[PDB]
Design a protein around this ligand. Structure first.
Ligand SMILES: Nc1ncnc2c1ncn2[C@@H]1O[C@H](COP(=O)(O)OP(=O)(O)OP(=O)(O)O)[C@@H](O)[C@H]1O
Ligand SMILES: CC(C)C[C@H](NC(=O)[C@H](Cc1ccccc1)NC(=O)c1cnccn1)B(O)O
Ligand SMILES: CC(C)C[C@H](NC(=O)[C@H](Cc1ccccc1)NC(=O)c1cnccn1)B(O)O
Ligand SMILES: CC(C)C[C@H](NC(=O)[C@H](Cc1ccccc1)NC(=O)c1cnccn1)B(O)O
Ligand SMILES: CC(C)C[C@H](NC(=O)[C@H](Cc1ccccc1)NC(=O)c1cnccn1)B(O)O
Ligand SMILES: [Mg+2]
Lengths: 181, 24, 297, 181, 181, 181
């Protein structure tokens, strides 16, 4: 067994890589297996991800909201873009983050230019607008902010230190070091 | 390992009582 | 024989008399009550047994209790239930307890612990408790039992399992794998197809997957289990009376969908009849006095 | 066993990747195995796909329509282009989608330019027209729309939220979260 | 075992990928193994291929004509160019196709330009002409057409729907869906 | 078993490669497994890394500070950029380095240009400034320097020989050769 197989025996999934469809289908497959192995024991989800992806975000957003088990998110070094939404998507009272982890909340973007007629670009922009409102509505029900506050805050990159990510509501506890180590 | 012992009980080898032929 | 006027009405009351013990499980009762109506209307198949059931379902919702409510209905006690505890049969060679030893082996004279229970009582409810926990060819010895209606003894006597009602209570925690709306019976039905050999499933008359005990049935189950400790175990000139808030408190503590009626039974021996057994030994309330149970919080 | 092997034991196939011939032959091989293992137990098909491919679409469209088992489609984060047709291709009463899954119905396109003489391009265009009518005839027998309504709706990209994909007829139930999680 | 290993136990080979020499040597190795395992039981050959290759076509054309077992071809989503010849190359009475599978019969081409002197190009063109006549002679003995009819029909791309591929003679039955699914 | 599997049985992890997210998630998975196997036995961490990465640094900085086991860092040939911070991040009294290992402490940089509006670049620069202060605050609590001294020292590349890395406070012992060898 790997370490990654050993953490999964203790119901811990790594996000680790960026949230694309390949990573989202991995995490959804891991969240549903861990739901079936013990639905009343908390899945822990370690997040060191640079973000990326919205449908892949909302694939593993909805799955960690679907499953019978409570999700404990732990931000390791980084939760940027989509991964900060997944960090807030843990169960309240859960959602740890290590003390030097940065949390980068950020409005949705298009990676590169997508061409098309203006009637096709009015739809790709009505979609990136409803991707923006869905990013802010999701992040408001998990941080307790007012979803126009998040639109003002995620208007640019807002890098949150873990101590000011629990003041923002992204996490709940900046988890302390166990032994001085 | 899961080789069964097969008791294999014998038929009863038992004694016999006797009718006797009467004589003087 | 052609039925007494009393026995005709009782047998049309057979659902509502088996519901005096079985709370809920309505299609489970009216599948096993129709099998007795077939036998007594003279419509029993004279080759096939009277009833052949797999009472599959969740653990504690009344699989064994319906087999005991059936045996009390047909006989007057549930000690007339032939209960073959199939957890004892863990390997292939304990099938020599169903029909006894073959010739030339010890235990040949005793000739089976199921066949000789039915030579004495051919009209019998034969319970096979936890048939999933038998070996994969214990129940392959019952593939002539459930169509031809007889099992050849090791001594060489075909015994009539025709007038028996065979019941195979299989035992089939929260939600399964993956996304699904709501929250089941087809999961239990197809697990029987993977565990049991579909030669055995075709011989079963009815496969009945049991229901979750609802909260409206746990409230009725409180009244049944309090009726155990009073009257049979409080024949000490003591009377046990529960207020309607007290039976509501027992139902709110004993109700978990995934187990059913044993967490209620563990609740009553944790709230009621262990606090009551401390009050009898201390003689706070003792023999010759009516116990009322007010609600605690 | 992987999680993907564990979901397949519970008769769940991921679409996951885009619908190309490599992915279509995988899903057809998975649909026919799951038909042979138990033809009367519902195959579930998880769809997080960005679409793509029409012959690969109609390869796994026809297979999930062929097999003896009912197909339960579940849109995870995305069913775009060909995958939205596969999402509607589930059995009626089935066809779930998670609440933040987008469904992108979309008329067939050519990825890049295909050159040729005009008599060869009249045939590649009569094919992309009958690919368009077959996309609309398929999506009309599964949504209950009138197939000219779908031509008007899929004239541009029509991104459907899951709540308005059951109003459109693509899915039947926006499936609720099991525990709050 | 994979699904692909499971279909091969039931004597089913996928064409799946395009017909190149790597795919042709795979299918010939699979056809000869399945001939040796049971020569009197029908090999099924699933075809979702975009075609390509003529010597690789006639490698697995001749092998599926060689072997003692009857070949049942099934067009999944596509049988283009070479693969449509392999689709017709099944045993008569066999040769199914799924209802939305397209069959693209097509005259042989050169992928890209091959240079050379004109005496070398008179030979590469006498070869692509006898590749054309061999494509039409093969497709005439399996469709019952007159081989000048096929030259008129495969003069351009002729995309056949499965219902009009049995009218053409490429397949025999458009195979019906088993359960509504 | 590899040698790398054999060193991990003796609770030794290699940093080895540069600190990116792929390497950080490996080391965090290794540090948490070795914490769970024996939390009171010292994890050794071999560092031959060219550095790189800040969130990946602070991912495995925080983990080696989190775990119940004391971390013994050993610089093999190089601890540059982030890896010198990880070298100082070992337990005091631990933190060896081989006698010819160089330690390159270095202020955070951006690999390549990141574009954007000036209001977006005021945030990427307020982040690389707080990445700089966090690099200096971390390296001050582990070397005992005054964090403005480290800003003066890491203003350029400061390559420390192991003998002058214990004078700096990065390591504690330049560990001697066992046998002359
Ligand atoms: N339907 C029921 N009616 C009345 N009491 C019930 C019922 N179901 C459960 N109980 C109570 O809980 C006990 C468990 O019921 P039963 O013995 O039938 O369990 P079971 O369903 O066979 O479970 P298992 O899977 O463990 O065999 C009963 O003896 C009774 O006290
Ligand atoms: C903050 C959350 C919402 C995610 C952030 N941005 C997005 O929403 C991502 C950014 C992205 C990633 C890859 C390719 C294109 C765009 N948006 C999308 O995935 C996306 C997809 N289709 C249309 C529009 N946006 B993150 O990636 O910065
Ligand atoms: C909506 C359904 C029908 C599928 C959508 N589009 C298509 O039909 C796809 C889009 C596509 C994908 C890959 C390469 C070229 C074209 N069309 C085809 O596959 C295709 C293939 N050959 C000729 C014409 N179209 B999807 O890919 O946007
Ligand atoms: C019925 C089939 C054979 C018709 C088409 N295929 C071909 O003609 C293929 C396509 C191809 C592949 C490689 C190099 C050149 C050409 N023709 C050949 O294989 C080929 C090979 N050598 C000389 C001439 N043609 B189809 O796949 O487009
Ligand atoms: C000394 C420690 C802090 C690490 C050093 N520098 C950094 O902090 C690294 C240097 C680096 C590496 C890869 C890609 C881009 C930038 N900083 C970062 O990783 C980084 C990441 N996001 C924004 C700004 N800096 B090392 O890489 O020279
Ligand atoms: Mg029981």
């Amino acid at each position: 067994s790997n370490p990654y197989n050993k953490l999964f025996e203790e119901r811990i999934i790594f996000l680790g890589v960026q949230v694309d469809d390949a990573s989202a289908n991995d995490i959804m497959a891991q969240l549903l297996v861990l739901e079936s192995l013990d639905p009343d024991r908390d899945i822990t989800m370690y997040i060191n991800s640079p973000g990326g992806g919205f449908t892949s975000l909302m694939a593993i957003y909805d799955t960690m909201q679907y499953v019978r088990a409570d999700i404990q998110t732990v931000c390791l070094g980084q939760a940027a873009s989509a991964a900060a939404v997944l960090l807030a998507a843990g169960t309240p009272g859960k959602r740890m983050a290590l003390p030097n982890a940065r949390v980068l909340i950020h409005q949705p973007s298009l990676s590169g230019v997508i061409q098309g007629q203006f009637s096709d670009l009015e739809i790709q922009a009505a979609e990136i607008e409803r991707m923006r409102t869905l990013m802010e509505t999701t992040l408001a029900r998990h941080t307790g902010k007012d979803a126009g506050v998040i639109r003002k805050d995620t208007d640019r990159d807002k890098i949150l230190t873990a101590e000011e990510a629990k003041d923002y509501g992204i996490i709940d506890t900046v988890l302390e070091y166990r032994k001085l180590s | 390992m899961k080789v069964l012992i097969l008791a294999c009980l014998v038929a009863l080898a038992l004694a016999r009582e006797l009718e006797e032929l009467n004589v003087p | 024989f052609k039925l007494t006027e009393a026995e005709t009405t009782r047998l049309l009351r057979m659902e509502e008399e088996l519901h005096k013990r079985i709370i809920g499980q309505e299609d489970a009762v009216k599948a096993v009550s129709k099998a007795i109506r077939r036998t007594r209307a003279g419509l029993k198949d004279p080759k096939r047994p009277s009833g052949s059931f797999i009472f599959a379902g969740p653990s504690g919702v009344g699989k064994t209790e319906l087999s005991k409510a059936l045996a009390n209905f047909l006989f007057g006690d549930d000690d007339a239930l032939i209960q073959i505890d199939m957890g004892e049969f863990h390997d292939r060679f304990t099938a020599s307890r169903l029909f006894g030893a073959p010739p030339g082996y010890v235990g040949y004279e005793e000739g089976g612990q199921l066949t000789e229970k039915v030579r004495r009582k051919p009209f019998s409810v034969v319970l096979f408790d936890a048939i999933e926990k038998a070996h994969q060819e214990i129940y392959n010895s019952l593939l002539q039992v459930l169509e031809d209606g007889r099992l050849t003894d090791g001594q060489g006597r075909t015994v009539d399992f025709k007038n028996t009602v065979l019941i195979f209570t299989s035992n089939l925690k929260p939600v399964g794998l993956g996304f699904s709306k709501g929250g089941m019976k087809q999961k239990v039905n197809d697990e029987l197809k993977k565990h049991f050999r579909p030669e055995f499933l075709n011989r079963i008359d009815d496969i009945i997957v049991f229901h979750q005990l609802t909260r409206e049935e746990i409230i009725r189950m409180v009244d049944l289990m309090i009726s155990r400790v009073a009257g049979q175990l409080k024949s000490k000139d003591m009377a046990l009376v529960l207020t309607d808030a007290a039976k509501a408190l027992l139902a709110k503590r004993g109700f978990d969908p995934v187990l059913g009626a044993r967490p209620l039974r563990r609740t009553i021996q944790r709230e009621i009849e262990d606090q009551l057994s401390e009050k009898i030994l201390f003689e706070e309330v003792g023999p010759g006095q009516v116990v009322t149970v007010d609600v605690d919080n």
